[PDB]
């Protein structure tokens, strides 16, 4: 159990003419995908890219981005997926820290700004080059780093082939899988939600319908035209889908919702329109979701992330002791999808792992049936009169008020700390206080309110 | 390295889903966990401990499912015994497996094993009070979960990892949905039946369990319980065909065991709408390792299909890979392939080659990568030598009354003869040289008083070497 046949290679052998990828006006079969990825690997090799090297990728959602990721695997190269939305400065830090020798990008980015720290390669230019055929890496080592993905000083998450494989399988056991399934991705492939779908695609033999960005009209048209059954969304995406439909598209059986709990109004709308929304919890460190909540529980387990996927585990601890149901503590996770360690962060690794468990940095609790409730980041915790104040919970309450457009709460000095709130239309301190008192324990109610422009 | 115990986690995730339907009684995953934990507690009370080995001798019933899971929860290796085996065969496997216990019921004669093992009656056992224990919450992926004997029989060590990957790989191949229900009417002590129990807890899928195959009872069950998958052997399938005009409409997959099936069976299945997935695998692979979709059944006669995901097959002769349609030894590799035979280092050394397992069958691939299994006995060579062809030539000699040939390492053929009259090795060699390709000529000649044959009078070539004598020099 140390190595597997390269997923794309085996998938192309098993079902060569099934569709791997739909992008714009293009359909790519698994045979075509393997061929394109092998070709690109040959071209990279001609640019002196070698087994054991590290290559970064800076691209928008494109077919070529999918080729490049798979080409890296076929060469035995670690792929560093870079966030397009960061500053060049931040990008340079990750290039240095990751030890990347190469940057795979295109002319829509400022290539010259990177040419001093890595060999910068334009993918469109590269694909037109001649190159000698090579022998590809026909096996994936399960414990080898496949991708490196930075947190947000950022830490590089080492995601192994094993991690990605077990994420895909556990998700399949949770959601079910059939030959008719097709997954629509309109979020960035450099984030683990999008990236993981590429791996599900070759492992399941499942088509990915790839969009460069989210446009609700384009997505609805694509769902109907390309028989989409699954889709990953954030809340603003789900809100727009709901707004533009009379009912859920008949083919959609799973909407995988990231970005935390859905508000009750949104879930009630999903119920009426038949949107099968799976809420979830996960992170870069767990190679996408590790906990999910089925649609049938969405009303009765309001605010819950759900239960762990098969093979994965969660627990709640406080000072190294395990908590009772409903008792608050740090969320810790364990499973074959969980990262082994951060790249070159000895102290971070030492602090983050306890006996094969990863500490998430999140606080939460389990109910008597084992459903997870995520409360806030441990680091944002505010202590008032010995009681815990979770700013995120207070901010969420305030945000649910029609008019607050934005909200942040911080600890203010007092004699030990009290919550202050920093916030569409005018509203009195009295009205806000009444509102919060209904929804929050007395010590969590903001002592003072401030209105700002942003 | 480790996973949470599958039944424990399944009971935590979906407690109210139905795990087992047996004689129309329903058992939820939560109930299955409770029963298995209680049985484990009752077993510990009878001095069963982590690291022990316990044999199970039962017909299909809910209690047999409890017994397998109870063993896992105690950290006990489970030996699943073929109930059709004779008393002496059972005795051999109990001793060879290192079993300390035998879990059975009053339908078997437990007393005749008590000189080898402590015997436990499962029905008496389940009535008993017993102190609660802490179960083994984790399954070690590399640890032996079950021991299952081949047809000397060899004990196949099947790890938790093996069973897990077999289950996951089959799901990737066949698909899985919350509506699926899998009917099992063949023995749970065979790997096809046993593997359904692990699919059950890992997928969270209902198994409809029959004590035995009765065709009318199985048809009624398929209709009543909306069965979508079923495991069968050829005799089973033939009976289903005879009792229907069209396949029951809920069935989406009939997983047929035992390798490629005969054309007339396949043709009638197609006509009647039976979706037969052919397959090939073994105890050593923890169930199927290749499968063939129904739409290929008539067009790829003799094929068992393509490898499950993560799994590999190759055709080899003398370490050389074979071209398409070229015959060679079928060899397999994957996370579902067994650890090793238990306490049988000779068989391990003979069966494995650079990490691949030799199946002992010959086959070939077509152009599209589909595996065909040939219906033997032969030696290579590195060409082919049918011992029967060499034996036929030797037999035709006037001084030779009987001949047997087997492979030896000098890989060459050796001959074993019963003679009417004396004849020299030189003469026999030349006699063969005139009638046979040069790599088919026996390198050594032995003169025996008789040749070993089985009850059907077939020559047992594997026994010739040990019987060697009267070498012609
Ligand atoms: Ca003769």
CA distance B214 to chain A (A): 31
Neighbours of B298 (CB within 10 A): 12
The whole-angstrom separation of Cα B23 and Cα A86 is 62
Contact A172 B172 (CB under 8 A): yes
Residue B256 φ then ψ, to 5°: -95, 120
Q: Is A260 on the interface with B (CB under 8 A)?
A: no
- The domains of chain B are located at 1-378, 379-473
Q: Which site among B172, B174, B275, B286 would you substitute to test the A interface, given the most A Cβ atoms closer than 10 Å to its Cβ? A: B172
Q: Positive or negative, the Cα torsion across A35, A36, A39, A45? A: negative
Q: With beta carbons less than 8 A apart as the criterion, state whether A267 and A302 touch.
A: yes
- In A, which residues are within 8 Å of B200 by CB distance? none
- Bin B23: left if φ > 0, else alpha if -120 < ψ < 50, else beta: left
Q: Return the CATH fold of A378-454.
A: GMP Synthetase; Chain A, domain 3 (3.30.300)
Q: With beta carbons less than 8 A apart as the criterion, state whether A343 and A97 touch.
A: yes
Q: With beta carbons less than 8 A apart as the criterion, state whether A103 and A113 touch.
A: no
Bridge partners (DSSP) listed for residue B156 = B148, B341
CATH superfamily of B379-473: ANL, C-terminal domain (3.30.300.30)
CA distance A230 to chain B (A): 14
The whole-angstrom separation of Cα A122 and Cα A64 is 11
Measure CA B52 to chain center.
24
Minimum CA–CA partner of A253 in chain B = B177
- CA-based diameter of chain B, in Å? 80
Residue B100 φ then ψ, to 5°: -105, -15
Degrees, nearest 5: CA angle B283-B289-B294: 120
The whole-angstrom separation of Cα A23 and Cα A94 is 29
- Quickly tell me which residue has 């001959």 as its tokens: B415
Q: What number of CA atoms fall less than 13 Å from residue A92's CA on the CB side?
A: 11
DSSP string, B208-268: EE-SS--HHHHHHHHHHHT--EEEE-HHHHHHHHHT-SS--TT--EEEE-SSSPPHHHHHH
Q: Is A249 on the interface with B (CB under 8 A)?
A: no
B423 CA distance to ligand 1 middle (Å):
12
Residue A160 φ then ψ, to 5°: -80, 165
The whole-angstrom separation of Cα A424 and Cα B154 is 76
Using CA atoms, how far residue B339 sits from A86, A165, A195, B348, B352, in Å, is: 49, 22, 34, 9, 10
Q: With beta carbons less than 8 A apart as the criterion, state whether B359 and B395 touch.
A: no
- In A, which residues are within 8 Å of B309 by CB distance? 10-11, 14, 203
Q: Is A322 on the interface with B (CB under 8 A)?
A: no
CATH superfamily of A1-377: ANL, N-terminal domain (3.40.50.12780)
The whole-angstrom separation of Cα A111 and Cα A311 is 43
Q: With beta carbons less than 8 A apart as the criterion, state whether A384 and A419 touch.
A: yes
Shortest CA distance to B89 belongs to which of B129, B41, B170, B149?
B149
Continuous segment of H or E residues that includes residue A201 = helix A192-204
Q: With beta carbons less than 8 A apart as the criterion, state whether A110 and A88 touch.
A: yes
Query: Across the interface, which of B141, B203, B309 has its CB nearest the CB of A10?
Result: B309
The whole-angstrom separation of Cα A350 and Cα A331 is 17
CA-CA-CA-CA torsion for B161, B164, B167, B171, nearest 10 degrees?
-110
Domain B1-378 falls under CATH 3.40.50.12780: yes
Contact A1 B175 (CB under 8 A): no
Q: With beta carbons less than 8 A apart as the criterion, state whether A220 and A237 touch.
A: no
CA distance B265 to chain A (A): 26
Continuous segment of H or E residues that includes residue B317 = strand B312-317
- Quickly tell me which residue has 């000699």 as its tokens: B397
- Per-residue three-class SS string for A421-450: EECCCCCCHHHHHHHHHHHCCHHHCCCEEE
Kindly tell me the burial class for residue A243, based on how many C-beta atoms sit within 10 Å of its own C-beta (0-12, 13-18, 19 or more): exposed
Strand order from edge to edge, sheet including B412-419: B400-408, B412-419, B444-447
For helices A63-75 and A192-204, the axis angle rounded to 10 degrees is 70
Degrees, nearest 5: CA angle A141-A142-A148: 90
The whole-angstrom separation of Cα A340 and Cα B324 is 42
* Pairing status of strand B77-80 against strand B144-149: parallel
Using CA atoms, how far residue B254 sits from A334, B44, B221, B319, in Å, is: 37, 39, 15, 36
* Pairing status of strand B155-159 against strand B144-149: antiparallel
Contact B4 A370 (CB under 8 A): no
Query: Which two tokens mark B364?
Result: 């070939």
Query: Which two tokens mark A259?
Result: 């970005």
Query: Which two tokens mark A368?
Result: 């008597």
Measure CA A75 to chain center.
25
Using CA atoms, how far residue A360 sits from A322, A346, A371, in Å, is: 15, 17, 17
What does DSSP assign to residue B466?
A: G
Kindly tell me the burial class for residue B231, based on how many C-beta atoms sit within 10 Å of its own C-beta (0-12, 13-18, 19 or more): buried
User: CB within 8 A of B278, min separation 6: which ones?
Assistant: B256, B259, B260, B261, B266, B291, B292, B297, B303, B304, B305
Measure CA B459 to chain center.
25
Bridge partners (DSSP) listed for residue B315 = B330
CA distance A233 to chain B (A): 23
Shortest CA distance to B8 belongs to which of B134, B143, B188?
B134
Q: With beta carbons less than 8 A apart as the criterion, state whether A360 and A333 touch.
A: yes
- CA-based diameter of chain A, in Å? 74
Minimum CA–CA partner of B139 in chain A = A311
Degrees, nearest 5: CA angle A359-A363-A369: 100
Q: With beta carbons less than 8 A apart as the criterion, state whether B76 and B50 touch.
A: yes
Q: What number of CA atoms fall less than 13 Å from residue B15's CA on the CB side?
A: 7
Shortest CA distance to B292 belongs to which of B303, B308, B274, B305?
B305
Kindly tell me the burial class for residue A350, based on how many C-beta atoms sit within 10 Å of its own C-beta (0-12, 13-18, 19 or more): exposed
Encode A177-187: b = buried (16+ Cβ within 10 Å), e = exposed.
beeebbbbbbb
Give the 3-state secondary structure of residue A113.
Answer: helix
């Amino acid at each position: 159990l140390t190595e597997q046949p390269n997923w794309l290679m085996q998938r192309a052998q098993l079902t060569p003419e099934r569709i791997a990828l739909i992008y714009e006006d293009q359909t790519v079969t698994f045979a075509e995908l393997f061929a394109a990825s092998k070709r690109m690997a040959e071209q990279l090799a001609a640019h002196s890219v070698r087994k054991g090297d590290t290559a970064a990728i800076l691209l928008q959602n494109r077919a070529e981005m999918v080729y490049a990721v798979h080409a890296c695997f076929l060469l035995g190269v670690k792929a560093v997926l870079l966030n397009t939305k960061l500053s060049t400065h931040e990008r340079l830090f990750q290039l240095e820290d990751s030890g990347s020798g190469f940057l795979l990008t295109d002319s829509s980015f400022e290539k010259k700004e990177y040419e001093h720290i890595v060999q910068t390669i334009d993918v469109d230019e590269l694909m037109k080059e001649a190159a000698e055929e090579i022998e590809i890496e026909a096996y994936m080592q399960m414990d080898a780093t496949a991708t490196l993905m930075y947190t947000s000083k950022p830490k590089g998450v080492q995601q192994t082939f094993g991690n990605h494989y077990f994420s895909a399988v556990s998700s399949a056991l949770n959601l079910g899988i059939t030959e008719q399934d097709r997954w629509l991705i309109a979020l960035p492939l450099f984030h683990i939600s999008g990236l993981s779908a590429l791996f599900k695609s070759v492992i399941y033999g499942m088509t990915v319908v790839l969009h460069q960005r989210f446009s609700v009209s384009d997505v609805l048209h694509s769902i109907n035209r390309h028989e989409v059954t699954m889709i990953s969304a954030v809340q603003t995406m789900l809100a727009s889908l709901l707004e533009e439909t009379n009912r859920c598209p008949e083919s959609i059986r799973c909407i995988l919702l990231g970005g935390g709990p859905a508000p009750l109004p949104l879930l009630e709308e999903c119920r009426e329109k038949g949107f099968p929304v799976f809420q979830s919890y996960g992170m870069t460190e767990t190679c996408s979701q590790i906990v999910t909540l089925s649609p049938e529980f969405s009303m009765e387990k309001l605010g819950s992330a759900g239960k762990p996927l098969f093979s994965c585990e969660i627990k709640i601890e406080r000072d190294g002791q395990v908590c009772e149901p409903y008792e608050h503590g740090e969320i810790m996770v364990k499973g074959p999808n969980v990262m082994k360690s951060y790249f070159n962060r000895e102290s971070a690794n030492e602090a983050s792992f306890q006996n094969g468990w990863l500490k998430t940095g999140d606080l939460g609790y389990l109910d008597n049936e084992g459903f997870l409730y995520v409360l806030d980041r441990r680091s944002d915790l505010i202590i008032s009169g010995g009681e815990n104040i979770y700013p995120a919970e207070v901010e969420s309450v305030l945000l649910s008020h029609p008019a607050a457009e934005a909200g942040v709460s911080g600890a203010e000095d007092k004699k030990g700390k009290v919550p202050h709130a920093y916030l569409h239309k005018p509203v009195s301190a009295g009205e806000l206080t009444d509102y919060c008192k209904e929804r929050l324990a007395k010590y969590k109610i903001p002592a003072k309110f401030f209105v700002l422009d942003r």
